[PDB]
């Protein structure tokens, strides 16, 4: 019961700004344009603001981003949906030029 009390109220999910950028950049490459420098903190700020999810679910730490109980699962669902979308669309390209 106490563990649920903290999971519901607190911020059980947490990502380093670098591993967050590395892993979920596939979620919105335009929010974090590469080829140009952008600090880890403001990058994560722009990407998560771009996700259009409920902004009351997260707060930012000195070195890790912090999420409410139910967000991280939704982010992994989102990422695997995108990886499916993309591997099928790269296959769209692979078949398109192979057919060319």
């Amino acid at each position: 019961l106490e563990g649920i009390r903290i999971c519901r109220k607190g911020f059980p999910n947490r990502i380093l700004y670098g591993d967050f950028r590395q892993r979920y950049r596939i979620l919105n490459p335009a929010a974090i344009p590469e080829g140009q420098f952008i600090d880890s903190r403001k990058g994560a700020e722009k990407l998560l603001s771009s996700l259009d999810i409920d902004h009351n679910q997260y707060k930012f730490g000195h070195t890790k981003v912090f999420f409410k109980a139910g967000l991280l699962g939704l982010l992994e669902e989102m990422r695997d949906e995108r990886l499916s979308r993309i591997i099928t669309r790269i296959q769209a390209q692979s078949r398109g030029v192979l057919a060319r």
Binding site: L16, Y17, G18, D19, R21, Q22, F37, D39, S40, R41, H62, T63
Partner: protein, 50 residues
């Protein structure tokens, strides 16, 4: 770029944890500037260094 990174690499600031005597970056802006130049990642660079 490598000369520049060796310049930035001295600007990375590290702070000791309150009890583990382990280095964590406060000056993350200098570490991600360095990694951006050397083509590493800020997190795995900092994790490897510390």
């Amino acid at each position: 770029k490598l000369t520049g990174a060796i310049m930035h690499f001295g600007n990375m600031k590290f702070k000791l944890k309150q009890r583990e005597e382990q280095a964590e970056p406060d000056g993350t802006e200098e570490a991600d500037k360095s990694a951006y130049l050397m083509g590493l990642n800020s997190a795995d660079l900092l994790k490897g260094l510390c």
